[PDB]
C-alpha cells in the first residue's frame, strides 16, 4: 500500500538532459529504500550524511529525486565540493549535502548507431550554479570582448553542447544515468518514512 514511486524515477523510459535535470518530489508515501540498496545493478552508490542501511528507520520533511544523464567520468562531479563543467554549469550539490548519489551505466539504452545527440550539457555560463539551480537559457555565451549581438561567432558560442554518445565509446565517455536523493528535514511534519 501507498509505497513510494521509486520505479517511476529509476525505470523511467526517457531521462532529461543534465542541464534540464528533472526533479521529482516525494511526499506522503512509505519508502522502501531496500529496493535500491539491495540491488547490485549500480555502478556508483555513494551516500553523504546518512547510511543507506539506516534509511528505512528514518523520517524526513521531504525527499527530492533528481534524475539526469551525464557521461562516464563526469559522474565524479555529482558529489559535494566538486568542480568541473557539470558541477559548475549543470548540476551543483551543496557542501552540506545529506543524501545519496546513485549512478549506473546505460550505454544500451541511451546510445545508438551514429551517436545520440538528444542529450546535452551546458559548457559555458557567466557564473557557477548555486546548489540545486537549473539554467535552461540558451543565450549565446560571450567569451570575449565582442558583443555577440545574439548570433554565434568569434568568441561567441552556443551555451549547450551535445554529448555524442557513440556505442563504441570508452567506458569514460559512455552515458550513465544518475539519480540524486535529497533528504531535507525542516520544521515541518515528517511525511516520508519507512518500515
Amino acid at each position, epitope marked *: 500500500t501507498n509505497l513510494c514511486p521509486f520505479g517511476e524515477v529509476f525505470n523511467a523510459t526517457r531521462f532529461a538532459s543534465v542541464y534540464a535535470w528533472n526533479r521529482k518530489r516525494i511526499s506522503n508515501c512509505v519508502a522502501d529504500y531496500s529496493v535500491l540498496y539491495n540491488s547490485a545493478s549500480f555502478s556508483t552508490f555513494k551516500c*553523504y550524511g546518512v547510511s543507506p542501511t539506516k534509511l528505512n528507520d528514518l523520517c524526513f520533511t521531504n525527499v527530492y529525486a533528481d534524475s539526469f544523464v551525464i557521461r562516464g567520468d563526469e559522474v565524479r562531479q555529482i558529489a559535494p565540493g566538486q568542480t568541473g563543467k557539470i558541477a559548475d554549469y549543470n548540476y551543483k550539490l551543496p557542501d552540506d549535502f545529506t543524501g545519496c548519489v546513485i549512478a549506473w551505466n546505460s550505454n544500451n539504452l541511451d546510445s545508438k548507431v551514429g551517436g545520440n545527440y538528444n542529450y546535452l550539457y551546458r559548457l559555458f555560463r557567466k557564473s557557477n550554479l548555486k546548489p540545486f539551480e537549473r539554467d535552461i537559457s540558451t543565450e549565446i555565451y560571450q567569451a570575449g570582448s565582442t558583443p555577440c549581438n545574439g548570433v554565434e561567432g568569434f568568441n561567441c558560442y552556443f551555451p549547450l553542447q551535445s554529448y555524442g554518445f557513440q556505442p563504441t565509446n570508452g567506458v569514460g565517455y559512455q552515458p550513465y544515468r544518475v539519480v540524486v536523493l535529497s533528504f531535507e528535514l525542516l520544521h515541518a511534519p515528517a511525511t516520508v518514512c519507512g518500515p
Partner: antibody, heavy 129, light 108 residues
Framework: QVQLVQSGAEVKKPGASVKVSCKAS????????MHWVRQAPGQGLEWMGI????????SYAQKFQGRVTMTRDTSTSTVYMELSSLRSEDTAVYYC??????????????????????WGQGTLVTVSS | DIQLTQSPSSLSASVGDRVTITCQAS??????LNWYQQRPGKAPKLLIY???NLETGVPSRFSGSGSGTDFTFTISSLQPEDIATYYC?????????FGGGTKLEIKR
C-alpha cells in the same frame, strides 16, 4: 571559488612554539575534514594529522604526538595548528589541505576519501637562533 | 606505517616523450593511492586519485593504474609545463605517507 589562506611565514627560536592559521573561504567550513602536511626544504611531504571542523575531533601522527595541537574556530571558519618544542628538523613549509567528504558504501561501510583537492599557499617556519 | 618507494628519483625526457613513474608500497592498499604534481614554490596539485581516476581539470595525457603494492603513473606526450616533482600518497591505513618524489626535467 574555494580558497585556503594561511598565515605569514615565521621565525622562532629552538624550543619555542609556532601557531599557523588556515582560513577557509568559499565553502561550508563545518562539512569537511582539514589535514596538515609539512614539507622540509628539499625533502618530501610528511603527514601531520587530521581535524574535524564540525565537532573538533583530532588525530595526530605518532611522530608529533604530544607536541602538535590542532584548533578550530567555526565563527571565523579557520583552523589553527600549533607545534611546540621546535627543533632544526621542523624548519619546513606547512600546508593545510581539504579532502572531499567521506561517503557511505551501498552496504553501509564508511569509506574514507583522503585525497587533497585544495591546498593553502604554505607557511614557512624557520627555526633558528 | 606504510612505506612508499618511488622509481626513479629523477629523470629527463624530451618534448612529446612518454613518461612512466612507479610507486611501490610496503603493504597492500587496494587502490587507495593518489598522485600529486608539486611545482617549485607552489603547493602540491592533485592529478590522479584512487590510482586510476583523473581529477577534474587534468589533461587527457595523464593516466594512472596499478593495484596491491604496485602502481604506475604515465604521461602520454610530455608537454613543457609538466616539469615538476611528482609524489604518490596512500590513505588505506593511518598514518598517510608520501613517496620520495620524482623530479622530472625536460630535454631541450
Amino acid at each position: 571559488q574555494v580558497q585556503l589562506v594561511q598565515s605569514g611565514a615565521e621565525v622562532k627560536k629552538p624550543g619555542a612554539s609556532v601557531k599557523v592559521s588556515c582560513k577557509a573561504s568559499g565553502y561550508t567550513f563545518t562539512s569537511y575534514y582539514m589535514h596538515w602536511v609539512r614539507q622540509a626544504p628539499g625533502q618530501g611531504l610528511e603527514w601531520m594529522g587530521i581535524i574535524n571542523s564540525s565537532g573538533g575531533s583530532t588525530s595526530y601522527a605518532q611522530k608529533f604526538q604530544g607536541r602538535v595541537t590542532m584548533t578550530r574556530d567555526t565563527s571565523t571558519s579557520t583552523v589553527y595548528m600549533e607545534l611546540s618544542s621546535l627543533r632544526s628538523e621542523d624548519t619546513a613549509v606547512y600546508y593545510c589541505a581539504r579532502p572531499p567528504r567521506n561517503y557511505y558504501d551501498r552496504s553501509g561501510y564508511y569509506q574514507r576519501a583522503e585525497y587533497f583537492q585544495h591546498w593553502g599557499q604554505g607557511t614557512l617556519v624557520t627555526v633558528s637562533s | 606505517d606504510i612505506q612508499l618507494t618511488q622509481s626513479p628519483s629523477s629523470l629527463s625526457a624530451s618534448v612529446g616523450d612518454r613518461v612512466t613513474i612507479t610507486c611501490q608500497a610496503s603493504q597492500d592498499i587496494s587502490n587507495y593511492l593518489n598522485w600529486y604534481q608539486q611545482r617549485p614554490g607552489k603547493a602540491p596539485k592533485l592529478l590522479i586519485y584512487d590510482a586510476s581516476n583523473l581529477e577534474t581539470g587534468v589533461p587527457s595525457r595523464f593516466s594512472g593504474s596499478g593495484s596491491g603494492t604496485d602502481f604506475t603513473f604515465t604521461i602520454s606526450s610530455l608537454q613543457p609545463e609538466d616539469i615538476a616533482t611528482y609524489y604518490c600518497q596512500q590513505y588505506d591505513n593511518p598514518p598517510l605517507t608520501f613517496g620520495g618524489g620524482t623530479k622530472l626535467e625536460i630535454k631541450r
